[PDB]
């Protein structure tokens, strides 16, 4: 908790120097902690509906980005916020739960899946704005730029 013990972690890294700065290690630690904390907040929107983060992401991505016929698996992953083994049986599970359907693959929301997102979105949108709220307009755009810029350097 806090920046309480960033100083402790900073001085701990300094002891490893035996005769450069700790910024990069601290910055990544902070983003990692931020990723977890953001997870917690965003989760509340849909935890009671029985969804997890991978499930909500897939549903929401279809809601915003699927055309009426749906999205194919390549497209879908390219448009979703979350990828990786974290998302292994998300489609299987959501099919199971009646919230998405297939057609010819090609995936879309069922009516129950769409009403569900429609009902949660206002709170998801509220939480999204609330977690960024400590930051101004510049700052938010700056965060945007730096993240895109870092992210660009790694996308290969």
Are 76 and 67 within 8 A, CB to CB?
Answer: no
- Residue 41 binds which entry of Cl ion, its own copies, none, CB below 5-8 Å type-dependent: its own copies
* CB of 13 or CB of 95, closer to its own copies: 13
Helix (H, G, I), strand (E, B) or coil at 103: coil
15 near Cl ion, rule: CB under 5 A: no
Q: In the structure encoding, which two tokens stand for residue 133, read together?
A: 């709220």
* CB of 27 or CB of 88, closer to Cl ion: 27
Query: Residue 61, class by beta-carbon neighbours within 10 Å (0-12 exposed, 13-18 middle, 19+ buried)?
Result: buried
Q: What angle (nearest 5°) sits at the alpha carbon of residue 112, between those of residues 107 and 113?
A: 45
Distance of CA 153 to the CA centre of its chain: 19
Please, which of residues 54-93 interact with its own copies by CB under 8 A?
Answer: 64-65, 78-79, 81-84
Cβ neighbour number for residue 75 with a 10 Å cutoff: 16
* CB of 95 or CB of 121, closer to its own copies: 121
- Kindly state the smallest distance separating residue 77's Cβ from its own copies, in Å: 10
Q: Using CB under 5 A, which of 35, 104, 152, 156 touches Cl ion? A: 35
- Site for its own copies, rule CB under 8 A: 1-3, 5-6, 8-9, 12-13, 15-16, 20, 23-42, 64-65, 78-79, 81-84, 121, 125, 128-129, 131-135, 139-144, 146-155
């Amino acid at each position: 908790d806090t920046a309480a013990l960033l100083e402790r972690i900073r001085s701990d890294w300094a002891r490893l120097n035996h005769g450069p700065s700790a910024g990069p290690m601290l910055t990544l630690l902070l983003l990692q902690r931020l990723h977890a904390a953001l997870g917690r907040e965003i989760e509340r929107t849909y935890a009671a509906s029985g969804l997890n983060a991978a499930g909500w992401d897939l549903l929401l991505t279809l809601y915003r980005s699927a055309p009426p016929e749906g999205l194919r698996p390549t497209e879908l992953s390219a448009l979703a916020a979350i990828s990786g083994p974290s998302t292994s049986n998300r489609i299987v599970r959501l099919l199971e739960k009646g919230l998405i359907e297939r057609r010819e693959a090609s995936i879309r929301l069922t009516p129950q899946g769409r009403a569900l997102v429609t009902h949660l979105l206002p709170a998801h949108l509220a939480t999204t704005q609330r977690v960024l709220a400590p930051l101004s307009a510049q700052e938010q755009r700056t965060l945007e730029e730096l993240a895109g810029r870092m992210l660009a350097g790694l996308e290969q």
